[PDB]
């Protein structure tokens, strides 16, 4: 027998406030 | 023990609600929510 | 026939088993 483990979700922040402001700032 | 796909999320806690099972429910529900909202957060709907 | 059971935190499961699983 083997156990099936579900490991919860750990994430790093992708955007700053829903947006990535580096690219937005370039284009702006 | 073959896979069974886990019917409706609160399936477990409806039988002898415990602390660990309730924490598990909360965790999986918020994980689904987070994933879907992130996918819609950056991209958006099909239209 | 090993019927499935409700989930428990991993540490308590691997400790109760006491065998490398």
UniProtKB/Swiss-Prot annotation, chain A:
Record remark: domains: The prion domain (PrD) is a Gln/Asn (Q/N)-rich domain, which is unstructured in its native, soluble form, and which forms a parallel in-register beta-sheet in its amyloid form. The first 37 residues of this domain are sufficient for aggregation, propagation, and transmission of the [SWI+] prion.
Function summary: Involved in transcriptional activation. Component of the SWI/SNF complex, an ATP-dependent chromatin remodeling complex, which is required for the positive and negative regulation of gene expression of a large number of genes. It changes chromatin structure by altering DNA-histone contacts within a nucleosome, leading eventually to a change in nucleosome position, thus facilitating or repressing binding of gene-specific transcription factors.
Subunit description: Component of the SWI/SNF global transcription activator complex. The 1.14 MDa SWI/SNF complex is composed of 11 different subunits: one copy each of SWI1, SNF2/SWI2, SNF5, SNF12/SWP73, ARP7/SWP61, ARP9/SWP59; two copies each of SWI3, SNF6, SNF11, SWP82; and three copies of TAF14/SWP29.
Organism: Saccharomyces cerevisiae (strain ATCC 204508 / S288c) (Baker's yeast)
Full-sequence portion shown in this chain: 659 to 686 of 1314
Subcellular location: Nucleus
Family assignment from sequence similarity: Belongs to the SWI1 family.
Organism classification: Eukaryota, Fungi, Dikarya, Ascomycota, Saccharomycotina
Source organism superkingdom: Eukaryota
Name of the protein this chain belongs to: SWI/SNF chromatin-remodeling complex subunit SWI1
From Swiss-Prot, chain B:
Compartment(s) of residence: Nucleus
Name this polypeptide is given: SWI/SNF chromatin-remodeling complex subunit SNF5
Role: Involved in transcriptional activation. Component of the SWI/SNF complex, an ATP-dependent chromatin-remodeling complex, which is required for the positive and negative regulation of gene expression of a large number of genes. It changes chromatin structure by altering DNA-histone contacts within a nucleosome, leading eventually to a change in nucleosome position, thus facilitating or repressing binding of gene-specific transcription factors.
Parent-protein residues present: 316 to 362 of 905
Subunit and partners: Component of the SWI/SNF global transcription activator complex. The 1.14 MDa SWI/SNF complex is composed of 11 different subunits: one copy each of SWI1, SNF2/SWI2, SNF5, SNF12/SWP73, ARP7/SWP61, ARP9/SWP59; two copies each of SWI3, SNF6, SNF11, SWP82; and three copies of TAF14/SWP29.
Comment field (misc): Present with 217 molecules/cell in log phase SD medium.
Residues annotated as transmembrane: none
Family recorded in the similarity comment: Belongs to the SNF5 family.
Organism annotation: Saccharomyces cerevisiae (strain ATCC 204508 / S288c)
From Swiss-Prot, chain C:
Domain of life of the native organism: Eukaryota
Cell compartments where the protein resides: Nucleus
Other notes: Present with 217 molecules/cell in log phase SD medium.
Subunit record text: Component of the SWI/SNF global transcription activator complex. The 1.14 MDa SWI/SNF complex is composed of 11 different subunits: one copy each of SWI1, SNF2/SWI2, SNF5, SNF12/SWP73, ARP7/SWP61, ARP9/SWP59; two copies each of SWI3, SNF6, SNF11, SWP82; and three copies of TAF14/SWP29.
Purpose: Involved in transcriptional activation. Catalytic component of the SWI/SNF complex, an ATP-dependent chromatin-remodeling complex, which is required for the positive and negative regulation of gene expression of a large number of genes. It changes chromatin structure by altering DNA-histone contacts within a nucleosome, leading eventually to a change in nucleosome position, thus facilitating or repressing binding of gene-specific transcription factors.
Protein name: Transcription regulatory protein SNF2
Parent-protein start and end of this portion: 418 to 438 of 1703
